[PDB]
Amino acid sequence: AYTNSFTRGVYYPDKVFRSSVLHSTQDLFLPFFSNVTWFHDNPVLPFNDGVYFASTEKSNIIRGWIFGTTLDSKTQSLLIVNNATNVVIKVCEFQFCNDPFLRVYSSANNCTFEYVSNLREFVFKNIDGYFKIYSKHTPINLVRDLPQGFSALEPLVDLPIGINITRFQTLLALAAYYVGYLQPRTFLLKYNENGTITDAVDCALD
Amino acid sequence: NFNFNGLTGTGVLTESNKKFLPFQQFGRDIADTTDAVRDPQTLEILDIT
Ligand SMILES: *[C@@H]1O[C@H](CO)[C@@H](O[C@@H]2O[C@H](CO)[C@@H](O)[C@H](O)[C@H]2NC(C)=O)[C@H](O)[C@H]1NC(C)=O
Ligand SMILES: *[C@@H]1O[C@H](CO)[C@@H](O[C@@H]2O[C@H](CO)[C@@H](O)[C@H](O)[C@H]2NC(C)=O)[C@H](O)[C@H]1NC(C)=O
Ligand SMILES: *[C@@H]1O[C@H](CO)[C@@H](O[C@@H]2O[C@H](CO)[C@@H](O)[C@H](O)[C@H]2NC(C)=O)[C@H](O)[C@H]1NC(C)=O
Ligand SMILES: *[C@@H]1O[C@H](CO)[C@@H](O[C@@H]2O[C@H](CO)[C@@H](O)[C@H](O)[C@H]2NC(C)=O)[C@H](O)[C@H]1NC(C)=O
Ligand SMILES: *[C@@H]1O[C@H](CO)[C@@H](O)[C@H](O)[C@H]1NC(C)=O
Ligand SMILES: *[C@@H]1O[C@H](CO)[C@@H](O)[C@H](O)[C@H]1NC(C)=O
């Protein structure tokens, strides 16, 4: 299934405050009105240059994601999971299961990094060894499909994991979600008087 | 004169009304000079006119 990304997936490109100003920036962004894949489903998906991920949900069925390349302990992989009390992030040579669910992996070894902390939207980037996560949450009129309108994702964490990533997979607890890929685009960002991005122009759209 | 995390300059540091989001560390001028900064110890926001 497919659906259309109605200006969703903009995020704060840097930690510099700006207000009442229009600023042009060149970065990996989800192009406006992009053809995004629609799931209802836990197959392995490519990561490319980065992912936009969104979930529309009511019972918190989606609990996290796994990122990596071989996903078979021959290489390191990144595990991100949100349990009932804490967000947990680990980078280990995980031997993941054929059908992970909350029983994600058979074994874990050579672990070098660990960190412990409606519509829900996320963006995942991997640049020069840094894995950056942005998100925002918002109540919306429907659970089945992606809404209209503009909103900007705030940075959530910036992990210096330093690992190669080419594929990823969603973790479910025993709902619908959307996946889009970021591309190098030039965007003109409108910052309001409160310093929040309130609109954007995808300079290569039309 | 000031030196915030290496950011070195001169100005009349003043308490800022600018509503920096929790992740933001600096503010910029059109010339990309720093216009506001977050104190690395108190985390308060200061104007740099
Ligand atoms: C990151 O991992 C991918 C595998 O997922 C590597 O991809 C290979 O890259 C070489 C060229 O460098 C190609 O000849 C292979 O065909 C690629 N394999 C696949 C399965 O696509 C990639 O090289 C890795 N990069 C780093 C820096 O480790
Ligand atoms: C969420 O994950 C954390 C791990 O980061 C869990 O904390 C561990 O809990 C066990 C007991 O079940 C302790 O033995 C460990 O020492 C804890 N680790 C840390 C780092 O605190 C936490 O219990 C999980 N939450 C739930 C509800 O299962
Ligand atoms: C942990 O990672 C290291 C690589 O950093 C693995 O080292 C390899 O070990 C096998 C024997 O088990 C050797 O044949 C390879 O030549 C080693 N690789 C390198 C680059 O030296 C190690 O196996 C991993 N640990 C486990 C338990 O699998
Ligand atoms: C900028 O932020 C302020 C809050 O810091 C907003 O002011 C509030 O707006 C609501 C209506 O949305 C009023 O009910 C409150 O009384 C206002 N508070 C104050 C202190 O004025 C303001 O609307 C925001 N502006 C924009 C353009 O987002
Ligand atoms: C979205 O892309 C797929 C190919 O991945 C294509 O078959 C489909 O027709 C496209 N849908 C729209 C609405 O453009
Ligand atoms: C640095 O000192 C201030 C008090 O001047 C304190 O509030 C702050 O917590 C300290 N830094 C950290 C990281 O705790």
Side-chain angles (χ1 to χ4, degrees):
Chain A
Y2 296 86
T3 191
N4 191 353
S5 69
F6 306 110
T7 77
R8 292 283 156 166
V10 174
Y11 62 89
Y12 292 84
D14 46 50
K15 304 192 172 185
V16 173
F17 174 94
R18 307 178 205 266
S19 67
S20 300
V21 69
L22 307 184
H23 181 259
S24 296
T25 187
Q26 188 270 311
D27 211 330
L28 274 55
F29 290 101
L30 179 69
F32 274 12
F33 311 103
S34 292
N35 187 358
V36 298
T37 309
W38 180 16
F39 300 100
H40 307 87
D41 287 338
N42 65 352
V44 181
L45 301 175
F47 189 80
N48 299 312
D49 289 317
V51 167
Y52 165 85
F53 182 105
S55 178
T56 47
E57 258 183 307
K58 61 185 171 76
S59 308
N60 297 317
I61 304 301
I62 291 148
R63 300 301 201 78
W65 315 261
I66 57 170
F67 307 83
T69 59
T70 67
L71 303 171
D72 69 352
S73 78
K74 296 193 190 94
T75 64
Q76 284 192 313
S77 295
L78 164 69
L79 167 65
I80 298 183
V81 65
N82 189 329
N83 80 24
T85 61
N86 307 81
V87 176
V88 179
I89 302 184
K90 287 186 68 173
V91 180
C92 314
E93 298 190 308
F94 293 106
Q95 173 55 63
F96 299 114
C97 300
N98 184 57
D99 195 350
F101 59 80
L102 306 190
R103 299 193 195 268
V104 183
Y105 54 86
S106 308
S107 64
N109 189 243
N110 283 331
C111 213
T112 56
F113 181 99
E114 175 170 336
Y115 166 86
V116 181
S117 198
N118 297 348
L119 169 63
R120 305 190 196 273
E121 302 186 61
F122 304 83
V123 164
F124 306 112
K125 301 174 72 177
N126 188 34
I127 298 181
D128 299 335
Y130 291 84
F131 186 91
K132 305 188 188 292
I133 312 186
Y134 311 74
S135 69
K136 184 166 283 284
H137 306 164
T138 289
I140 66 158
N141 303 83
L142 77 171
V143 179
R144 66 184 295 272
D145 193 9
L146 193 73
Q148 311 309 131
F150 180 90
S151 187
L153 314 190
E154 294 165 38
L156 181 67
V157 70
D158 189 351
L159 307 169
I161 67 179
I163 67 157
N164 185 5
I165 293 165
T166 62
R167 299 191 298 158
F168 88 105
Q169 185 180 245
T170 314
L171 274 51
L172 306 180
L174 293 179
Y177 69 96
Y178 323 86
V179 178
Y181 295 106
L182 312 179
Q183 291 177 224
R185 296 290 270 217
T186 301
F187 269 54
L188 178 77
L189 302 177
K190 177 180 176 76
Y191 289 83
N192 73 355
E193 55 262 58
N194 293 347
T196 80
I197 297 166
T198 55
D199 207 353
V201 179
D202 179 359
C203 298
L205 172 64
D206 65 19
Chain B
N1 294 322
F2 59 75
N3 182 352
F4 289 98
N5 301 335
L7 168 67
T8 300
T10 309
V12 297
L13 298 181
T14 303
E15 303 194 339
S16 189
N17 66 281
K18 295 188 176 198
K19 301 183 180 176
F20 277 37
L21 290 75
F23 60 91
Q24 292 168 330
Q25 307 303 311
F26 306 106
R28 278 190 178 192
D29 195 8
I30 307 299
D32 282 272
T33 58
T34 299
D35 179 73
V37 67
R38 183 180 298 275
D39 181 278
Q41 306 190 359
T42 70
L43 309 180
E44 77 198 79
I45 309 305
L46 307 171
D47 279 3
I48 315 188
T49 51

